[PDB]
């Protein structure tokens, strides 16, 4: 189990432009195209994207290419954060999968506003941070991907995903 599998697993997989748990606009592997009700908004982003003519329809390859670009992203962006980096370097490696997999779903800012629970990751107190990252409108919305993310930092094993 690698972070690529994981998210997979996580966002799933769909080769036409979809509506996200949020109401927004995606494709491929959890890419969101837009915030905005434009479904022709949408189809705009994603040709931007792809740099093609698509109409809401990528190929697998597409979606992968997407996907490759965004968990870069999500890595750069944890690196490049004050507040996000030092909480990476002080975790092990499938607990950084962790916080990888929450920086893709909910952006660099989002994730930065866990203020108290980076501290107690940062702190290496497990059932605690696990406790808080509950309390939030995040695992309200999506209760079984944030259990399986809230498992994984709780642990330090792949346990929630080998399920699967």
């Given at each position: 189990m690698n972070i690529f599998e994981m998210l997979r697993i996580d966002e799933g997989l769909r080769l036409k432009i979809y509506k996200d748990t949020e109401g927004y606009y995606t494709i491929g592997?959890?890419?969101?195209?837009?915030?905005?009700?434009?479904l022709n908004a949408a189809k705009s982003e994603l040709d931007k994207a792809i740099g093609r003519n698509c109409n809401g329809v990528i190929t697998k390859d597409e979606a992968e290419k997407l996907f490759n670009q965004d968990v870069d992203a999500a890595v750069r962006g944890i690196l490049r954060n004050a507040k996000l980096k030092p909480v990476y370097d002080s975790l092990d490696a499938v607990r950084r999968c962790a916080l990888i997999n929450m920086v893709f779903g909910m952006g660099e800012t989002g994730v930065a506003g866990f203020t108290n629970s980076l501290r107690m990751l940062q702190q290496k107190r497990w059932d605690e941070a696990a406790v808080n990252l509950a309390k939030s409108r995040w695992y309200n919305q999506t209760p079984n991907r944030a259990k399986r993310v809230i498992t994984t930092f709780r642990t330090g094993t792949w346990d929630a995903y080998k399920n699967l």
């Open positions: 592997i959890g890419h969101l195209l837009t915030k905005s009700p434009s």
